[PDB]
Amino acid sequence: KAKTRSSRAGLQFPVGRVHRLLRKGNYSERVGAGAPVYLAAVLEYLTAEILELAGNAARDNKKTRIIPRHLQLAIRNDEELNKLLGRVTIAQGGVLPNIQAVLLPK
C-alpha cells in the first residue's frame, strides 16, 4: 500500500530524508511539500553530472573504479563545475597538468 515519496517523484535521492533535514536545519518555520522533492532532484542531477565526467576520466586511465583524482580532473576541466566548486579543495585531488609556456626549453 505505502510507497516512498522518492518513487512518486521518480528520484533515487531520499525525498523523505531531505524534507526532515530541511525542518531540522532551522531554514524556515514551515517547509512546503514541493521543496524537498525539487531539492532532492537538483542534488541527484549534480551528482550524476559529476559521476558521468569522473567515470569518463576513469575510463581514460584504464581504471574500473573512480578515485579522487578522477573527480578533480572532471571538475577542473568543466568550466561550470570548476566555477561551482571554486572555493572547494578535493582531498587527494592533485592539480591539472599545466607548465607555463615560457618555462619549456627551445
Binding site: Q72, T89, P97, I99
Partner: protein, 98 residues
C-alpha cells in the same frame, strides 16, 4: 660522466608531481608541527588522525595554489625564478595580507 642541463630535471619533477596526488610533506614532522601550534591555544589536546590528515590536505593544497599564483607574478616580471616579493604580491592581491 653524464649530467642533465640545469632545469631539465625541474621540468621532469613538475610533470611527475602534477601527474600524482600523494601528500608531499612527511606525515610525522607535520603532525608534530600541528600539536606544537595547538599547544599555544590549549594544552593536553588530542587529535583524530583524520583531523591531522585533513589539516595536511588543506595545507598542501593551499601552498600548491599560492605557488601557482606566485609563479605567474614571477613570470609577469619577465623572470622564471619565484622570489619572496612574488609571494607577497600574490598574498597582497589575494587579500591575505594588508
Amino acid at each position: 660522466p653524464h649530467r642533465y642541463r640545469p632545469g631539465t630535471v625541474a621540468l621532469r619533477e613538475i610533470r611527475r608531481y602534477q601527474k600524482s596526488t600523494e601528500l608531499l610533506i612527511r606525515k610525522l614532522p607535520f603532525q608534530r608541527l600541528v600539536r606544537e601550534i595547538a599547544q599555544d591555544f590549549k594544552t593536553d589536546l588530542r587529535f583524530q588522525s583524520s583531523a591531522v590528515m585533513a589539516l595536511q590536505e588543506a595545507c598542501e593544497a593551499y601552498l600548491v595554489g599560492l605557488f601557482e599564483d606566485t609563479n605567474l607574478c614571477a613570470i609577469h616580471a619577465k623572470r622564471v625564478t619565484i622570489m619572496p616579493k612574488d609571494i607577497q604580491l600574490a598574498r597582497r592581491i589575494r587579500g591575505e595580507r594588508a
